[PDB]
Enzyme design. Structure first.
Site, PDB file in Angstrom:
ATOM      1  N   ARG C  62       0.761  -1.219   0.000  1.00  0.00           N
ATOM      2  CA  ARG C  62       0.000   0.000   0.000  1.00  0.00           C
ATOM      3  C   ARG C  62       0.809   1.295   0.000  1.00  0.00           C
ATOM      4  NH1 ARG C  62      -2.628  -3.903   1.537  1.00  0.00           N
ATOM      5  NH2 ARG C  62      -0.644  -4.429   2.402  1.00  0.00           N
ATOM      6  N   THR C  63       1.771   1.401   0.882  1.00  0.00           N
ATOM      7  CA  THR C  63       2.400   2.708   1.012  1.00  0.00           C
ATOM      8  C   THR C  63       3.204   3.062  -0.253  1.00  0.00           C
ATOM      9  OG1 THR C  63       2.381   2.421   3.383  1.00  0.00           O
ATOM     10  CG2 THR C  63       3.691   4.256   2.526  1.00  0.00           C
ATOM     11  N   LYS C  90      27.828  -2.740  -2.745  1.00  0.00           N
ATOM     12  CA  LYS C  90      29.259  -2.440  -2.835  1.00  0.00           C
ATOM     13  C   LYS C  90      29.732  -1.683  -1.590  1.00  0.00           C
ATOM     14  CE  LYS C  90      29.548  -2.568  -7.907  1.00  0.00           C
ATOM     15  NZ  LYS C  90      29.186  -1.790  -9.146  1.00  0.00           N
ATOM     16  N   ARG C 111      11.061   4.271   3.783  1.00  0.00           N
ATOM     17  CA  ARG C 111      10.667   3.325   4.842  1.00  0.00           C
ATOM     18  C   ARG C 111      11.902   2.554   5.221  1.00  0.00           C
ATOM     19  NH1 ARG C 111       5.598  -0.852   4.697  1.00  0.00           N
ATOM     20  NH2 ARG C 111       4.590   1.127   5.298  1.00  0.00           N
ATOM     21  N   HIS C 139       4.236   6.145  11.417  1.00  0.00           N
ATOM     22  CA  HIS C 139       3.783   6.039  10.036  1.00  0.00           C
ATOM     23  C   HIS C 139       2.798   7.217   9.855  1.00  0.00           C
ATOM     24  CE1 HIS C 139       2.669   4.612   6.234  1.00  0.00           C
ATOM     25  NE2 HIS C 139       2.504   3.327   6.490  1.00  0.00           N
TER      26      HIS C 139
END
Lengths: 307, 322, 303
Positions: C62-63, C90, C111, C139
């Site tokens: 969803r986000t 790397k 996130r 959130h």
């Protein structure tokens, strides 16, 4: 820059970009001027629509943060679009060959941007593609658009490329970026001196140096090899361009106390410990600004190729 | 423009699940629309028909053509794509397929779904409000492949009615040949179909049995072979070949496939027996069943086939979303 | 038309604490306006030539998708950066990765499993970062869309009784939602429904203690969905644990007529599919409200 024109560099029209050798000095300055005009318009908030309805497809068979993202962003900021093809999710997992993968994305796209761990994979792709391919890195071969954006960075930061003393530092043997940069600088500018700073095992290859030997001699470019950032390299260099292993060559704040006031530190990135975070706050640290110059150089390149 | 690019009205707002859902008139309308799309795009014209509309790909299997061509088609119509990746999604936290569909259906105008379970498309249709386009459902169907394949035959040969076509390879597991045989036999008067496969990988009864009425009504000749015999080579207008899905190889399929492999390979030597005017097609990806020695032959249509696919998918997306 | 919320211009979004009640209602009204226009088939071009880069170091359906769709529906563009195919392999640091994407983008949506990662990102980025979840922290845009959902479905936010159910300790969505509701509304009662081991943290409750007291908010803890919680709650907001607390059709027979069930999703078995056909099941609608709230946010930040 509302009254600025964005003339495409005609010599690039419809052509693949594989090597720093393909550019003239005139091409490079035209790209530099075009990139700066791009930067002015974008930073002023102008919306460009030059490449509406044109598609770039990335074909990355090795990892990338800057080159992949910079090219996608550049295409988008010209009004173009990107198809987000991922090699790991593709029919290569059912045995599709490289050549057939190229033909597949060539069927849908206006330009392909390809990075591959095999040096000859670019030539293979060119053999089957109808549309231009831009080499985003071919093994330990070249990275021609990095050399272009590096030169835009030097020009913008120092004001001149002719006459500089530049150290190329680190893994010169496997460094595709320094291969392209040495070719671009020596072929097209009046460089004063190049320090090649590396352990002997990682020195700049003969296959880069030998083709340049005639120009080096006729232009009187001084080439000085070292295995360390000596006081001389620090005191004389207008540019320290360092790289990651693909020695007393670390650049940190302590080392920078030896550097001149008007110089820049560059790094194509990603970096590891060879370039200390202690340098990041220094006005001479140009390696983050270098990434943004890359986006504008890639806008100039994409517009010139597809105009 | 309603003169230049009229949408195929019958497709408006509808999900595409099966080659069975199309009529002959639908198929020709899509073919003519796809040809108009090709004309405009190749002339450099920029289309804005789907500005502000979103397609979300939902691929649970690998894909090069079908994913990329749907994205490119959407982009070339002026629409946009949300690049949802199953591997980075809440499926990892136990989210069900149905809830995933509902999620992407909340943001999108059309979903394009490929899934290894044949019944996953119906499950998705049961909860989605927006159209779903089947980009392949297990060993079931690949309906937009059949549409682009038919565009390819029409464009390359001039006629679909009256052809002799060989479908070659893994006919049992090949969703592309299931959809193409359905589309062709239901909607055209095909002269003859050669079904060229090892016995263990022959065309399934679940495909052939529902087609028996059309086959009899139109007098279509159906012959099974386990080889590209001289007769198949001499008579075929289209050789449509496929990759053996060897990753699925009880031991009969593997052994029969090996025994037949050279006999069902198309190479420059075998092409010496082909008609002067005909085409070789392959939905791709290919392995060694279609030799690179054929790639320079004018009759090799399988690269052109991919570009016809982009234009067919422009015709389809525009018709569904207009 | 679509006036942006001026207070959001050019700012990063890190916490539910940064919004006032006026901000929240302005965002709600703007999101509703965008919904009307989009549902009418209108095409918006507000952010043409602007780029969002999602930087997701955890999974998301969803986000991630809603932010991309929201950017696109405003006329903007997305650079599809993947952590797994990047120079992180790397040895590139988080700081350098942020600096890299900040070089190309107008806004970063991030996130990350580490709570302090968003602050680290903020310390090096020039462009706004939107927090799409920072470990078990917050959130904030989930809280905004949750509040839009309550407003749109029930009509008032002041005066509600809300149950927050599930893993309250680790649930960044319930952390942000409790903050946003208690700070800016006059909530009648909050039921905190969780096993004792997973109750709402003291580091969320204590900063709210003054507001709780001065607005007279009733706070009750339970370890189960008791008949009282079911009968009194205007909103049942449940979450996934990462019998006593499961919501199914049987348990819904106790709920009032005028209420909603919400879930940030994804769900496991704590919210039965037997509830899905109930008109009170708002958790699918909640996702679409999320897209429009994210349109309101992106436009206000980038205007």
């Amino acid at each position: 820059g509302s009254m600025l024109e964005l003339p495409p560099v005609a010599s690039l029209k419809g052509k693949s970009i594989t090597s720093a050798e393909q550019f003239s000095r005139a091409d490079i300055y035209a790209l530099i001027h075009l990139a700066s005009a791009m930067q002015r318009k974008i930073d002023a908030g102008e919306v460009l629509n030059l490449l509406q309805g044109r598609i770039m497809t990335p074909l990355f068979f090795e990892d990338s943060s800057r080159t992949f993202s910079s090219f996608c962003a550049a295409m988008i900021r010209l009004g173009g679009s990107v198809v987000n093809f991922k090699v790991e999710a593709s029919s290569i997992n059912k045995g599709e060959t490289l050549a057939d993968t190229i033909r597949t994305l060539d069927s849908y796209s206006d330009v392909l941007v390809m990075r591959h761990p095999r040096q000859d994979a670019i030539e293979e792709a060119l053999s089957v593609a109808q549309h231009p391919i831009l080499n985003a890195g071919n093994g330990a071969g070249e990275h021609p658009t990095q050399a272009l954006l590096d030169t835009l960075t030097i020009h913008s930061e120092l004001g001149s490329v002719d006459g500089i003393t530049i150290a190329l530092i680190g893994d010169l043997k496997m460094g595709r970026t320094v291969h392209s940069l040495l070719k671009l600088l020596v072929r097209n500018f009046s460089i004063k001196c190049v320090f090649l700073v590396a352990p002997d095992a990682l020195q700049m290859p003969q296959d880069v140096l030998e083709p340049l030997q005639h120009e080096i001699a006729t232009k009187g470019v001084i080439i000085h090899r070292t295995h360390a950032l000596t006081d001389e390299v620090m005191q004389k260099s207008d540019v320290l361009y360092t790289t990651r292993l693909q020695a007393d060559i670390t650049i940190d704040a302590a080392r920078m106390r030896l550097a001149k006031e008007k110089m820049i530190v560059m790094h194509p990135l990603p970096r590891n410990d060879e370039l200390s975070t202690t340098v990041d706050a220094d006005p001479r640290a140009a390696y983050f600004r270098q990434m943004r110059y890359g986006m504008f150089m890639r806008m100039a390149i994409l517009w010139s190729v597809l105009a």
